[PDB]
Amino acid sequence: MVKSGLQIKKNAIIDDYKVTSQVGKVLQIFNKRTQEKFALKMLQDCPKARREVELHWRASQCPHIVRIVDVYENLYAGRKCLLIVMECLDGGELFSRIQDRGDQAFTEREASEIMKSIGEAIQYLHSINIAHRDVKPENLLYTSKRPNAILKLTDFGFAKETTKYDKSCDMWSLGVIMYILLCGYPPFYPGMKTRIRMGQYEFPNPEWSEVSEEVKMLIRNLLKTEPTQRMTITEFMNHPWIMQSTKVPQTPLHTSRVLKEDKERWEDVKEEMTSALATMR
Numbered sequence: 001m002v003k004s005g006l007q008i009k010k011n012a013i014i015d016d017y018k019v020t021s022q023v024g025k026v027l028q029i030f031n032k033r034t035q036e037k038f039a040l041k042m043l044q045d046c047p048k049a050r051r052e053v054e055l056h057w058r059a060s061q062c063p064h065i066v067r068i069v070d071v072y073e074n075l076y077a078g079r080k081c082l083l084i085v086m087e088c089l090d091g092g093e094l095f096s097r098i099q100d101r102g103d104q105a106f107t108e109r110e111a112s113e114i115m116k117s118i119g120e121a122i123q124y125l126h127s128i129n130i131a132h133r134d135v136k137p138e139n140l141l142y143t144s145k146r147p148n149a150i151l152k153l154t155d156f157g158f159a160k161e162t163t164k165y166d167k168s169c170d171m172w173s174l175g176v177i178m179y180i181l182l183c184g185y186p187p188f189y190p191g192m193k194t195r196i197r198m199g200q201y202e203f204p205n206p207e208w209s210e211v212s213e214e215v216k217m218l219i220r221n222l223l224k225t226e227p228t229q230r231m232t233i234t235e236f237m238n239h240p241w242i243m244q245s246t247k248v249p250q251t252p253l254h255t256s257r258v259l260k261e262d263k264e265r266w267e268d269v270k271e272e273m274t275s276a277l278a279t280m281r
């Protein structure tokens with residue numbers, strides 16, 4: 001129940017890690033004692049930088065959040081820097097994995113399982129009254145390239161402590177990610193297909209025809225316009241579909257085929273989500 005506080009080391013990082021002065025693109029480095037590989041984490045020391053690291057430190061323990069190993073305050077070309085050491089995440093981004101399946105065969109069940117992984121992260125946070133506020137594709141990365149790897153949430157660069165409705169956009173993000181997992185495109189309104197005509201019903205049939213109302217209902221609750229009426233993390237993780245993924249139909253989703261078809265738009269998807277987030281926060 002009692003966890004230790006953040007200790008930012010002051011001593012030069014290269015006493016501890018092989019870096020080789022090739023040193024915010026993220027770098028692979030090596031612990032000298034253990035010779036293990038890690039990632040790093042280079043920020044501009046600033047009040048804000050510190051609050052995020054703090055918040056991230058309070059969450060590192062969560063199995064579905066990228067762990068901080070060590071933090072250094074060092075001078076890089078006489079710029080005060082936070083160097084943040086974290087475990088390597090070589091698995092890539094959640095949706096890239098899905099898109100690159102050779103057979104292109106993703107199931108409702110797999111979607112359920114993923115969403116539980118992500119839910120867990122958000123539950124850890126929300127219950128210690130932190131809000132992530134930047135839950136999107138680029139921030140969901142896998143440990144290893146392997147089939148049985150683990151999902152970790154990243155970028156605490158919009159986190160903050162939440163004495164309520166700040167948590168709401170974490171849930172709106174859940175809504176969006178869930179929806180994309182289920183069909184391959186976001187629930188947002190040349191050369192390619194239009195997936196959701198403007199103003200039309202939120203679950204188009206080509207890809208949503210075999211998804212149950214139960215699951216459409218869960219999604220409508222996460223995307224609820226009014227935060228006063230949007231699903232909470234407690235409600236989410238208590239929902240049957242999340243709670244019991246093993247009983248979730250292995251419904252063949254269109255997701256992997258669509259992400260491949262609409263690959264040119266992915267930058268655009270991510271940008272529309274990022275824009276949207278800045279108005280929702």
Ligand SMILES: *S(O)(O)Oc1cc(-c2ccc(C(=O)N(Cc3ccccn3)c3ccc(N4CCNCC4)cc3)o2)ccc1Cl
Binds near residue numbers: 026028039086087
């Ligand atoms: S920050 O707090 O923003 O969180 C964060 C963490 C990572 C992160 C942790 C571990 C890794 C990692 O090891 N790799 C692999 C790698 C490969 C080559 C050189 C260095 N590292 C990794 C994974 C993913 C990414 N990015 C690239 C930019 N788009 C998103 C994925 C870089 C490095 O990374 C990464 C990013 C963030 Cl924000």
